[PDB]
Design a protein around this ligand. Structure first.
Ligand SMILES: CCCCCCCC/C=C/CCCCCCCC(=O)OC[C@H](COP(=O)(O)OCC[N+](C)(C)C)OC(=O)CCCCCCC/C=C/CCCCCCCC
Ligand SMILES: CCOc1ccc(-n2c([C@@H](C)N(Cc3cccnc3)C(=O)Cc3ccc(OC(F)(F)F)cc3)nc3ncccc3c2=O)cc1
Ligand SMILES: CCCCCCCCCCCCCC(=O)OC[C@@H](O)COP(=O)(O)OCC[N+](C)(C)C
Ligand SMILES: CC(C)CCC[C@@H](C)[C@H]1CC[C@H]2[C@@H]3CC=C4C[C@@H](O)CC[C@]4(C)[C@H]3CC[C@]12C
Lengths: 101, 285
């Protein structure tokens, strides 16, 4: 299979292995960016956060500003990928990250 | 006596394989899919061709003591095999192209009569390309060769026309349809997050397309060299390149070997179907 290693106040999630293509990425506890660049957020988020994707290096980023105590949780990165042109689309999770304030 | 032994071995292997495939396919009748019907018709054509191998095994040792109707039938079957294979493969490729690209299903929501009548149409259109073989191909008896080999009688002027017809139609037209359909399938399949609207149907469609493309590749690889040799013969007859005996004694053995490959494909098909399609053996035994 393939791996998904996260980072530590900027979140960077990377993927490596035998991947034919990456399709979707995002963060969970809320923010998901597709392969074409379209970004989606929750209905309760009025542009507080921002998500950017770097398809060349297969990395997804999450920018967080004006942090609040209610955001103290554990965040996991998710990705969708296909290991071959004739194979099935399947998704994998990451280990997770801990935010300590 | 190597050739009779080889012909008998191929006859046995092809008969067993194609009989097993046809029996397991007809076991679950009235529930086949379009690809299943097309593959069944390919199996029927292959077993119908390989059913003539003992005649050539006898001809390899003793002369052609069979008459003339058998000769006409054998030649017609040899031509019909590679006509029907190409045309049915083109039909299945067009079906796959439509399903992948336009998200339209002709043989699924429509009656099974829709694919039954196109199979009948391709069978008739293949018979109407081998009618000239029925008109010709009598059993001869030449001097310096005390034998009754099978050959052609019609004038050399008509040989070029028939060869051009066979080559042009049954090689170029299916090849163009193949190239267009498969280029579009690859373009619309290498960049799409999810075909159809779910995931199980997506992977099923990918698997079926893989099986179809491997079958098409096997058929093309087995049958292309004979058409190249016929093309070389056509060009050397017109005058593009010389008719030197050193260029004829070579195309003779080339024709022999390429026809042998075309015969071997008829027994190569079912084991390829079983090995790649592991699920086929699961429902077989
Ligand atoms: C440019 C297109 C615009 C319209 C073109 C109009 C016609 C142009 C004339 C074509 C000449 C150029 C040929 C290349 C064109 C690109 C399309 C292509 O390249 O396609 C064509 C191939 C070959 O045509 P044909 O063999 O049907 O000849 C038919 C002969 N007759 C009838 C005896 C069977 O058709 C195939 O199916 C190839 C499929 C395999 C290649 C992709 C494989 C992708 C997956 C990789 C691994 C797959 C593993 C399983 C496959 C087994 C190992 C390969
Ligand atoms: C495995 C079976 O292989 C065959 C079977 C039949 C023929 N076949 C032949 C035989 C006699 N034919 C000549 C020929 C004519 C037109 C097209 N192809 C071949 C051969 O070269 C036989 C042969 C096969 C393999 C050989 O290997 C080698 F290694 F020994 F070289 C040698 C000879 N005649 C025909 N006539 C009229 C109509 C149909 C045929 C018809 O089909 C050719 C192949
Ligand atoms: C309902 C009446 C359909 C009768 C059959 C129509 C023609 C079928 C034979 C055409 C063969 C032409 C050679 C070739 O390579 O064809 C490649 C494609 O055109 C094959 O088309 P098909 O999928 O058989 O066409 C489907 C016909 N429909 C659309 C009327 C259902
Ligand atoms: C020169 C001659 C021998 C060429 C072949 C002619 C005969 C044998 C062919 C032509 C039409 C063919 C039929 C066309 C369609 C079908 C329906 C299919 O579900 C089973 C096979 C079956 C029933 C075929 C059997 C073989 C057949 C009858």
């Amino acid at each position: 299979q393939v791996q998904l290693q996260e980072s530590g106040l900027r979140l960077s999630c990377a993927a490596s292995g035998t991947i034919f293509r990456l399709y979707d990425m995002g963060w969970y506890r809320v923010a998901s960016i597709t392969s074409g660049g379209s970004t989606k957020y929750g209905d309760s988020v009025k542009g507080r956060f921002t998500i950017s994707r770097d398809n060349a290096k297969n990395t997804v980023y999450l920018q967080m500003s004006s942090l609040k105590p209610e955001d103290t949780a554990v965040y996991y990165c998710n990705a969708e990928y296909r290991t071959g042109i004739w194979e099935e689309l399947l998704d994998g999770w990451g280990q997770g990250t801990q935010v300590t304030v | 006596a190597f050739l009779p032994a080889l012909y008998s071995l191929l006859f046995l292997l092809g008969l067993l394989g194609n009989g097993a495939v046809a029996a397991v396919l007809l076991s679950r009748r009235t529930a086949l899919s379009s690809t299943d019907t097309f593959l069944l018709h390919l199996a029927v054509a292959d077993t119908l061709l390989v059913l003539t191998l003992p005649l050539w095994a006898v001809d390899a040792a003793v002369q052609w003591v069979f008459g003339s109707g058998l000769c006409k039938v054998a030649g017609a079957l040899f031509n019909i095999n590679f006509y029907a294979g190409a045309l049915l493969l083109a039909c299945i490729s067009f079906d796959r192209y439509l399903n992948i690209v336009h998200a339209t299903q002709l043989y699924r929501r429509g009656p099974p009569a829709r694919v039954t009548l196109t199979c009948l149409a391709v069978w008739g259109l293949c018979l109407l390309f081998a009618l000239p073989d029925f008109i010709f191909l009598s059993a001869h008896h030449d001097e310096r060769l005390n034998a009754t080999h099978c050959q052609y009688n019609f004038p050399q002027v008509g040989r070029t026309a028939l060869r051009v017809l066979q080559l042009v139609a049954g090689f170029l037209l299916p090849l163009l349809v193949m190239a267009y359909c498969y280029a579009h399938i690859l373009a619309r399949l290498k960049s799409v997050r999810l075909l159809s609207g779910s995931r199980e149907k997506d992977r099923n469609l990918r698997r079926i397309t893989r099986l179809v493309v491997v079958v098409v590749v096997a058929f093309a690889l087995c049958w292309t060299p004979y058409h190249l040799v016929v093309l070389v013969d056509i060009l050397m007859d017109l005058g593009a390149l010389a008719r030197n005996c050193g260029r004829e004694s070579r195309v003779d053995v080339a024709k022999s070997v390429t026809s042998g490959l075309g015969y071997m494909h008829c027994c190569l098909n079912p084991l390829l179907y079983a090995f790649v399609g592991v699920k086929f053996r699961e429902r077989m035994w």
